[PDB]
Amino acid sequence: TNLCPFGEVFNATRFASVYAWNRKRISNCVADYSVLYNSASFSTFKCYGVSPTKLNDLCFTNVYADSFVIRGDEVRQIAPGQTGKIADYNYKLPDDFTGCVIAWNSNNLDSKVGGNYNYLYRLFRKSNLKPFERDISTEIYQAGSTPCNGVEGFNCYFPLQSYGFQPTNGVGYQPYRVVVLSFELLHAPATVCG
């Protein structure tokens, strides 16, 4: 009997940034969906490529856990065949994406009143990222006659910026923690089963 390492992922005190979304392995473990459903109550659930009820007996070879936080109004960005700032300049995925995504809210849990700038996101980048690509560089995106300096303001775009999330803001502006379970049913040994 092996305990799946899902509690820490689903109960992590802190979450990684959008440009540094946490990636975790899931293999060589046994998990039960009934206990998770009984003990976990998510808000938004969306699965492509497999029915929610078919996971009972499916012998998934491996799973990738991608955890991050985004803005509520940007929740539409994460979807197949979608174009946007988050999709292109921060995190790009294949158009024919398959897997599950669970999104929840921590407005009350993370109701840090006063300068809640713990979340940072890349404003823009020179080029468009490819599927399953990431970068943590601080290159200055000048694209103009402005001097090549890291100044935040008009006529000078900083590579990164802090989201203005507050508890009193609108619902669409509230933070959303998203965990994506990506399935790769390739020609590899099966290690996860019920």
């Epitope: 990684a16 700038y117 713990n118 940072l120 943590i136 601080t138 300096n149 890291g150 935040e152 802090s162």
Partner: nanobody, 119 residues
Framework: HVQLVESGGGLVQAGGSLRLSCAAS????????MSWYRQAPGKQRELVAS?????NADYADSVKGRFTISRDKNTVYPEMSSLKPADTAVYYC???????????????WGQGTQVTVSS
């Protein structure tokens, strides 16, 4: 402002192993990915390592394994071993700084730590 300076440096022995510890003291911190770079005469900046917010770290083939970094609770634990004379260089730390547009619109580039092999 965030002061990421850890140490000035130190001597390196043949096949030595140094375990630095980041101070992680200063202003408000954040779960921002960091990068570890090398410098030396005759060579430009090299992408030695890039570590995310505790997820995983990518290292160059030459530096793979025999240098490593771990991120945990906004703390950096470096693990270094198998140091050779070819490692005599200057280490540079690259981080993310946002609240710096008031009096120092510059990236938080820590002071280069010089390392040399000498008994």
């Amino acid at each position: 402002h965030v002061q990421l300076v850890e140490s000035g440096g130190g001597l390196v022995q043949a096949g030595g192993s140094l375990r630095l510890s980041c101070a992680a003291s200063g202003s408000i911190f954040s779960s921002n990915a960091m990068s570890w770079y090398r410098q030396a005469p005759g060579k430009q900046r090299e992408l030695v390592a890039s570590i995310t917010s505790g997820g995983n770290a990518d290292y160059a083939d030459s530096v793979k394994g025999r240098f490593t970094i771990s991120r945990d609770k906004n703390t950096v634990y470096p693990e270094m071993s198998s140091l050779k004379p070819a490692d005599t260089a200057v280490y540079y730390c690259h981080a993310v700084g946002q609240e710096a547009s008031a009096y120092a619109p510059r990236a938080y580039w820590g002071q280069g730590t010089q390392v040399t092999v000498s008994s």
